[PDB]
Amino acid sequence: YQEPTDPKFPQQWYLSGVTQRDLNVKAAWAQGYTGHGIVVSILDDGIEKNHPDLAGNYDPGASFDVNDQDPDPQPRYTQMNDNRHGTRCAGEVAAVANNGVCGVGVAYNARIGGVRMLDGEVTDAVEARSLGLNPNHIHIYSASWGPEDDGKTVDGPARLAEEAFFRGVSQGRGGLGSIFVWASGNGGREHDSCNCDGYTNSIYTLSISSATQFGNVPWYSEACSSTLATTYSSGNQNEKQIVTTDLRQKCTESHTGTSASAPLAAGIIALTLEANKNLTWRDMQHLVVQTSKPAHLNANDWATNGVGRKVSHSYGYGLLDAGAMVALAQNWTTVAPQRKCIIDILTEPKDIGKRLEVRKTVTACLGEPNHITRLEHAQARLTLSYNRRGDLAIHLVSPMGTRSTLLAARPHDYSADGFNDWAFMTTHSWDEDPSGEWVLEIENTSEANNYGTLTKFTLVLYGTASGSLVPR
Ligand SMILES: Clc1cc(Cl)cc(-c2cc(CN3CCN(c4ccncc4)CC3)cc(CN3CCN(c4ccncc4)CC3)c2)c1
Ligand SMILES: *[C@@H]1O[C@H](CO)[C@@H](O)[C@H](O)[C@H]1NC(C)=O
Ligand SMILES: [Ca+2]
Ligand SMILES: [Ca+2]
Ligand SMILES: [Ca+2]
Ligand SMILES: [Cl-]
Ligand code: NA
Ligand code: NA
Ligand code: NA
Ligand code: NA
DSSP: OOOOOOTTGGGOHHHHOSSSOSOOHHHHHHTTOSOTTOEEEEEESOOOTTOTTTGGGBOGGGOEETTTTBSOOOOOOOTTOGGGHHHHHHHHHHOOSSSSSSOOOTTTTSEEEEEEOSSSOOOHHHHHHHHTSSTTTOOEEEEOOOSOOSSSOOBOOOHHHHHHHHHHHHHTGGGTOOEEEEEOOSOGGGTOBGGGBTTTTSTTEEEEEEEOTTSOOOTTOOBOTTOOEEEEOOOSTTSOOEEEEETTTEEEEEEOSGGGHHHHHHHHHHHHHHHOTTOOHHHHHHHHHHHOBOTTOOOTTOEEOTTSOEEBTTTBTOBOOHHHHHHHHHTOOOOOOOEEEEEEOOSSOEEOTTEEEEEEEEOSSTTSTTOOSEEEEEEEEEEEEESSGGGEEEEEEOTTOOEEEEEOOOTTOOOSSOEEEEEEEEOTTTTOOOOEEEEEEEEEOSSSOOOEEEEEEEEEEEEESSOOOOOO
16 A cells, blocks of 8 residues: 655645654555545535646535525635635545555545535524435535534524435435534534533434644634544644645645534545445444544543443544444444433423532333334433533433533633423434433532523434443
8 A cells, every 4th residue: 555645645644653653544545445436515615616736536416505506516706715614624524645645535436425504694594405415426425514613502403404414314324324514613602512412412423523733722712522433633733733725726734623623534434335335324323323433532521331331422432433434334233223211300390599409210111112122322311401501411321331521611601591392312322222210410500599490301312222242
């Protein structure tokens, strides 16, 4: 195997590193996997389809302009180069290799398109037409953005976009399911908590956070239990950043944020899908859980879950490992059909006050076709009133003892509107047996005399009843 000769490939430290602080992508390339036959689409502000490092891989069938309602996602050029982000993300996935231009994509033989959707009013319909673009041609969708990362917003897909997610994972990709890769958010300096973003908090999105070059949680990162894994991105001014294609046929070394991590994950997923085209949308999440690596990622919340895997709310299961992903994909056995066990917990409304604990012992649909002994995602769907939402912190403890933070205190969130059946999701109990006692904790983290009521707590368990590995 000959590594790429592109002039900035040596600067792509998160791929070309020889110091074990990288995504282990050369190992996948050397196994023969470069993304051939895989189609990825960037949902963003457009794609410079004539970029010298993108044109060779550009796919019109992976592209559309839902802002202006035409097939051509070319960005709108402005003096400030506002609409450059989709071009940066496209190159992360699939910049051409060995062509003397810039660097390379993770999946440098994949086909790449873009949906121009963010350069205009983003409506539910715009979102749905983007998520649902050509779902039997595009394999993988990469989305780096969502509701405002101001640390006070609670919002998610409205009806058309949610329908697009379910149609995507159910009938997309020949029934194997569209793979939606999502950035978990850039709201760290606002103390944002990313389960409040219903796109990344979805089970249907494979959510990705960031690590800095020296292995730290970047200033912009949001912690939450819905995140699955991590890719490198930017940090402080002594740490390197992401090197990729830029608007106006240029090359940037200063692409940043969690919004730069999701495209790198999308490229690794493209390599993995080349290694096994029969993987389902859930298979792909299982592979990420099993192969991602905590080592050398610094956080104070690494915890071992019930099946022996380390998990963090900043990093999920750790750094994506492309070589391990493609290796495990090759002989992967398709997971069993997804079961869903619905457990309505409360028999009466519960005053929250300063602190509320709700304990319930469940059988996880014992005796029924939705019996789950092997958890995937779990949700605590909560309906509650509170006078100042951001003073709440919420935790969910599984029978195996795994404490998931569902909501951290958000100091800017002054809302008096509470949560209306909000489906806080955790990935941290993946592969655990969910039978037993679950504990929900709701706490007022402020000294104020805050008040409210929990009126509904639905525990929703997803998973299967077969195929478990010996704990790690
Ligand atoms: Cl599918 C998909 C893929 C992607 Cl990548 C994003 C969304 C995404 C975007 C936004 C729009 N932002 C402004 C434009 N951005 C830029 C970021 C960086 N630089 C420049 C612009 C991104 C963030 C918002 C919502 C939330 N969404 C909720 C449902 N909707 C409404 C609900 C109620 N009332 C009005 C509208 C529409 C808005 C999602 C959805
Ligand atoms: C894909 O997986 C399904 C489910 O296990 C199986 O029935 C089918 O034969 C597989 N197809 C290929 C081409 O491997
Ligand atoms: Ca256009
Ligand atoms: Ca190149
Ligand atoms: Ca956020
Ligand atoms: Cl469902
Ligand atoms: Na965001
Ligand atoms: Na997700
Ligand atoms: Na534990
Ligand atoms: Na149990």
